[PDB]
Subunit: 400 residues, 5 copies
Amino acid sequence: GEFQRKLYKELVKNYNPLERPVANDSQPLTVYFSLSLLQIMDVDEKNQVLTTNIWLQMSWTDHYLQWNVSEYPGVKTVRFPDGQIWKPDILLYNSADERFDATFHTNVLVNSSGHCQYLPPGIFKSSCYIDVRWFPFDVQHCKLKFGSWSYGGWSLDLQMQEADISGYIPNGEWDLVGIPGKRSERFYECCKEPYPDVTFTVTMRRRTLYYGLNLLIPCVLISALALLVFLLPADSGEKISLGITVLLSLTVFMLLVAEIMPATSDSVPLIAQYFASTMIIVGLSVVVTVIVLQYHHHDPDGGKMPKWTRVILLNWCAWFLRMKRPGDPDLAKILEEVRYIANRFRCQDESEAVCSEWKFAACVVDRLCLMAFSVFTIICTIGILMSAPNFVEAVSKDFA
Amino acid sequence: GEFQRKLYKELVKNYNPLERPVANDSQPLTVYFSLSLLQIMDVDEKNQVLTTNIWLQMSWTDHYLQWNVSEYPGVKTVRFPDGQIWKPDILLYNSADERFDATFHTNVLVNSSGHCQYLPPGIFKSSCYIDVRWFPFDVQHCKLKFGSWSYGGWSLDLQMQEADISGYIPNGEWDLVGIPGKRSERFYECCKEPYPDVTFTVTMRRRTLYYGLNLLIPCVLISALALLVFLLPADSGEKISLGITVLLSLTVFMLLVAEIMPATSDSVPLIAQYFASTMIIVGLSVVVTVIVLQYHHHDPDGGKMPKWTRVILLNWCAWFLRMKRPGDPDLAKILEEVRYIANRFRCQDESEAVCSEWKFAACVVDRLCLMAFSVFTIICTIGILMSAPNFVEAVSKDFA
Amino acid sequence: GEFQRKLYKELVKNYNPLERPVANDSQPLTVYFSLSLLQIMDVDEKNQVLTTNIWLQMSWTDHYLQWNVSEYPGVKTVRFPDGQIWKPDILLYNSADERFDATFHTNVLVNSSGHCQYLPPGIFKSSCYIDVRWFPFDVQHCKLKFGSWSYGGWSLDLQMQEADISGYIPNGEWDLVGIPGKRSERFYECCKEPYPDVTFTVTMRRRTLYYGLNLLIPCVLISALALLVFLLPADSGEKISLGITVLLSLTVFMLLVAEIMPATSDSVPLIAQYFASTMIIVGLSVVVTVIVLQYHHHDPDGGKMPKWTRVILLNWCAWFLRMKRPGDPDLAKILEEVRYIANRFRCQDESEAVCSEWKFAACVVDRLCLMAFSVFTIICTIGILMSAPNFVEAVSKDFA
Amino acid sequence: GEFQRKLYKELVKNYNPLERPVANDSQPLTVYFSLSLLQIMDVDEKNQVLTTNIWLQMSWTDHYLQWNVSEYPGVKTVRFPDGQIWKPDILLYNSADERFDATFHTNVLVNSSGHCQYLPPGIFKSSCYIDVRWFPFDVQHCKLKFGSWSYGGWSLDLQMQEADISGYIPNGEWDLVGIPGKRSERFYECCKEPYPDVTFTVTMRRRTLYYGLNLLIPCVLISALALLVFLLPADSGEKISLGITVLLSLTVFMLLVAEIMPATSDSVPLIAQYFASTMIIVGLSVVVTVIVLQYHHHDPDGGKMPKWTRVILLNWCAWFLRMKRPGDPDLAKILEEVRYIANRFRCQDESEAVCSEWKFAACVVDRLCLMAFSVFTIICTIGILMSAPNFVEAVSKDFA
Amino acid sequence: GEFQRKLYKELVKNYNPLERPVANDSQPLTVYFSLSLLQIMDVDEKNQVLTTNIWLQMSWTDHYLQWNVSEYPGVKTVRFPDGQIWKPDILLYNSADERFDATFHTNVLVNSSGHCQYLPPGIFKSSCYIDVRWFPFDVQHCKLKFGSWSYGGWSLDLQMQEADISGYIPNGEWDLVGIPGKRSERFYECCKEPYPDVTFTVTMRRRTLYYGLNLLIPCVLISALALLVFLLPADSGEKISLGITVLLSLTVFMLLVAEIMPATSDSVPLIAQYFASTMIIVGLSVVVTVIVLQYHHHDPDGGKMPKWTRVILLNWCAWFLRMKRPGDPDLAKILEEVRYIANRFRCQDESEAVCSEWKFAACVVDRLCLMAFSVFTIICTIGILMSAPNFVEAVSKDFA
Ligand SMILES: *[C@@H]1O[C@H](CO)[C@@H](O[C@@H]2O[C@H](CO)[C@@H](O)[C@H](O)[C@H]2NC(C)=O)[C@H](O)[C@H]1NC(C)=O
Ligand SMILES: CN1CCC[C@H]1c1cccnc1
């Protein structure tokens, strides 16, 4: 319209985008800054980078861009692109994007009295410390620091407004505990003037159903399956195969776990402790199985069972576990030959009895170690899992 | 020509590209918006991003860009590049691209009476919720929300038109169901003026032939092979090794499947339930194999067969399964020797009888568990596979 | 020089880069379009994207860029950069690049009579359907569709010229069959004016030496090795281990091939059919091995061999394979004791004979299944490989 | 300063950056072109690209940018940024980057006498054919082609200078042999105008210590370990597991090497034929092991051993291999039973004496195949490794 | 404000952003350069690049941009954007980014006396040589080389200020040691003028808790478990299975380690030496196991034990290891038929004695090799781990 054209022509006369729009030069310009979170796109733990979608909110007052609406009956607000108006240089300090600024430059909407709004959208990638000590039951706090780059405290007065989460779209993996903000003032080695900034601390909680049913339960099941090696009879020579293949499955699971975790040396993660405990238990079970097989195949005349071992294994541990241990001239020549055969059979019977005793001792050791290893596995698993904080509330929120 | 040159020179006289091309400033400007889909290029479930190829269609009326064809006989339409004509700032709200605007700026074609058309092509990436509860028999609805950033409802009148899919190129993995659209207007915390927007909901269905052939058939066949352990004689030791190798194969298949799936905790996927059921069945098979092996290698004099075990296995189940039950002084001194030899043979005889009885019990247990596990696996796989909605439709559309 | 400076000053006088350089505003402007292929950079089958290196070739005639060479001695050609003279807005419709234009804007060479040439180099990513039905003996036709975006048939008359391949650099994996071109005009839902375009079809063939030697032959030897299970004697307990290990290796190969191929449900790939056949054969071999082991370890007193089973296995198949089937009062007490031992030995001998007969039947079944499986796998592999079209051409070209 | 301010004001007066700075328009402009390499950042064989760090060097003479130093004391050189003075359009033809140009436009430094110098830096990404025939002992020649895009020899005649490698930073994998340059002069069919271009050939030699220590040596060790199947006694049923597990390790190594290799079908690479030979050797070892196991477990009465098998294995191969051949009325009825028992024992001993011959034949075949396979693997490995032309150079430079 | 509006109008009057802002053109302009480090974002060992977050700091003095604060009250500083005032062209030579300059162009702040400050932020990708010989216990020195591109001695002399690390954010992987810098002069053959540059050497120490808990310890544990083959009785067919399964775990773990190393042939890394040592240890263990099994299953009448072998393995080593050495006519017919049985039993007994001697010799060999390998592996591991510098500091810092 003619009035719009006239206003647009009159508004830009003698205007200078480099100038701060203040009536008095020695007074700071107040700028209100706020943030609107729409979605959390990614939390990369290996690279420790948070990718979110946010709209910035910058509102201030322009002294020159004012007019009387009576003289311009139709128009009420105007709009200016980048480069034709003065804008604050609000930047994210801890950005991780290759381009340090990742905001789409939209229009600035101007009031009939000079008020200016600026709502640029953006996919922001920032670097925040990520703690994996209590993984997967962890809670993360990532900071977002915004501030003016070249305007101090005596030039641009930054004020904070509470963040907006009405448009938030819930994420599948991460809950949103919340985003509080605070305004701080700092001194930099460059200069001798305070530089205010606004920091929003996004606090999220990880939902644990996926990891719990994909990574924890299989490990428990395989660890419990590794205990069947103590139930197999020694004659069926397939004990080392069982133990070593369970160990192989466990170590490939360990590699799968480690491929998604950053190589930080602050502390030992909970799942790392879990996998170490499972590794140790399976290795000890393999060692015990080797000892049991050594007992089972003992050479009957190789040696004698020591008295202490005989007592401990035969009369005490069997009592504990309620196990019962099993069990005419020509005539003389024929006589001595059949006597020789009978003596040979008697010696064979004694050797068999000794072998049976050794086999029973092996079975007793096997059962005792089965009981001990089951108790160890249960106690270690329960302790490691319940050591983490907020585990109860994570379980209650996710699995129930 | 001279007419074209003069018309271009005249049409830009006192033209401000910063004003809405309207005759009456109070009245809004109507802009017709539409979309033209060309190809659905990618659907990333892990990152939950939809990548498509679309042409936007914007149509409006410019009041200043009008002329008489009689004065310029040759010229009928003109073309204005980016930055020299007023264009709506319509963009995608939910964009998952590093640059928030992924459209290609092209010329605007202008009528002889002020009708401007704008057809910018683009490769658009958006973030939409991906539901994997019914993988692979799932249907996805992804929303594209377009709107003007800085023009409210009192200055811009966004009117929806119907999407065009006449040039759509079918995809080899996703079968397009449709793409309806709807207009809405919302209130934002920024301001006190309604803002309209247009949302197009792409509804698509996944073709399941590839997944059904490459992922479900191998698992079914491998689980069926896992049931061969109950048909394997216990004399040859190959049962534990076979079962554990099948377990390893299931583990690698599970990791391969989980490599491509989102780590969400909204619900337990159907494929995850299927894999868990198969894992449990194979683990129970290994446990039963251990029990049968322990029964078969039972030492003869190490105990007596319980009456309950006898009455459960040796008679009842054998009847039900129709398995037949398999069954001068020297003239003195030589006599006790031959009696000793005969008695030793007799003792060996009834020991062998007891061992044969135990082996028959083991065979009975093997047959029982074979039947039970076959029934269980068939029921479980059929129920899990058929529990998903629109599964018969997917089968009848892909396989037949 | 002075003449060059004068000419450059005169040419840009009153020149508008927005108008079509035509003497008459009604007649269309003829533009000659051509392509120069340099290399086939990539063919992503999984994403279905063709990346090529090409020089476009646009030629037209400009009415305003003319001068008399006599008045400007020495200068015979001028050059104008991007944004100072009119250029066609020719784009690639099938672009899969994040930016719809992947051309490098070079200079425009202008004649002494107004003939303008424009050869912008570029690396182009386009979307074409990659058929994988006959992997790896397949031929691909990928389309590159170029056209003007905002100029209709009444303004820009597009013309086609034969593509140039004189600078083609041969690719190590693809053989260029050819690159024909066609010109068509289509009607779009936007407007009521035809829009001409030029489509170039790149037809190329895949060389099948790498795949044949790395992926098909090793599977053939693995399948052949799987047949050795029908030669191991049953006493050596390794048949199940061999079969299951071969099956695991085949599954690993299956995952390796599956991770490069698209997830399309359009058709069943030939390689998928071939691997499915190999896996089915191996599984059937494992089942047959289980049956043979069950026959071999038969209880001597379990059950008599059926008459039909005897008359078949021990006679018909036995003759077919030309294998022959193997084959004083104390004196009374002494006699009665010796007779019992003799009778026990006789019973043992008869049981041994029965066991030997069962083992011979198992061997017969083993050899019969060996012959059957070898024939079946040979014919299946030959048929699947030979079913592909141009298989003979591919093998001849890539091997001989 | 005022002097350089006045100089800058005077120089750009009536200056056209589109004009070729030559005093005489008929004469062409001499441009000296050179390259300075700093680093071979990457050599990708799968994608066949070369990434290097390069400073270009362009030198020419300007006719209008000249001044007298006496009139402007203290000013000897000036500097002009991109887009304000004429610059050559030299480009790299065989580029492999999404943007065709990969240079960083720096300033142009200018003489007091008009000689212009220009040194843009860049991370250049070109495409060259990477031969892989003699991998790892391969030498690569990659060509960089530079030329003007729209200037001929009667407008701009390119010259040469030797490439500078004084600042080259040695790479840890590739050894630089040289960077020779060739100046090509192409003629068209229309015109006698030369067209000069400059091509630089980077010659690189791969340092093979890493590959020879991580791929060749472990494969040799595992293949040698695979030869122990001919040393294991057949009684311990573990002759098949060794071979199958070694074959699985070989397949894993083949997958590892195939992950990094291009899919070109130009020739069979050295590492590929090496792994094929090892595959064949292992498979033949498994077949021989099956034959030996068949010999060992022969039935005692399943058929007389062939005369040829006797006369060869038991005599000739035994002589060669220096292995020796290992090795009242009731009283009559009592007599009959004792004779029966003795005859049974005689028959058992005679039958047992037959199996010893089969076991000895198995041992003979085992040792003979051991020596044969040792010779085979040694010959194949030595020949395949020494077939490369650079083997001696590589082993004398890297390992020594 | 009117004062700053007038000041901004006055400052840019006759200002040329091309000339060097110095009062006397014969004197160099002093520029102070430094940087502030914020974070070490990534250290890529495979690609040999270093990603850091850095704020440059360049300060100088401008002769023209000066004013008296009395005439413009309330205005103390001004801000100019890129392209409106002169700035140094300081770049980083070691850049590894696609765009050579990765800095972000912010405003330049000018005081009342003409002092100019410029602090652009950036994420810089440098290319520094990474020495991986002592990995994990590694210390890295990475150089950043900053300098002007087209300014020399009497044009611009660069001066150093100390780097600032007061804002450094600790990394969980690398422990920063220091960032010492150096100002260096390069002299040309042209003329006596220094060319200054500034080099900053970042020294980082890797924190080795993650690697020591994920690579070294599990390798030690599995290698120790590989020694259990020397405790398994030979009667259980699992020695080869144990050894080769441990070998498989070792080789897959080696492949994982090689996935993260760079393919540099300058030196052999510590972890590679350790893995090779474990390879040889396990292979020799397998060979010894084969020899022991060969001794165990020796034919009783296939050859007497050599005298040397007897004296070595039955007296000397047995006393060393303290192993006990393990454990009417018819009557004539009866006599003859009984003597046969008696003599056969005696022959069986003596053959059993020979077999027992062979088995005891095998056990002695097994124990000897157990002790030898147990010493060897400990010695090799301790030596390899302790052969690295700063190992004691690394453990005492990371672990304790
Ligand atoms: C404008 O800013 C500069 C910042 O360097 C001031 O220069 C410093 O001023 C302090 C105060 O006397 C001195 O201690 C420093 O030695 C100065 N630095 C240098 C390199 O000279 C400068 O004084 C300020 N000018 C005005 C009018 O405020
Ligand atoms: C044929 N052109 C290219 C695609 C749409 C169509 C068009 C028509 C009018 C204005 N812009 C584009």
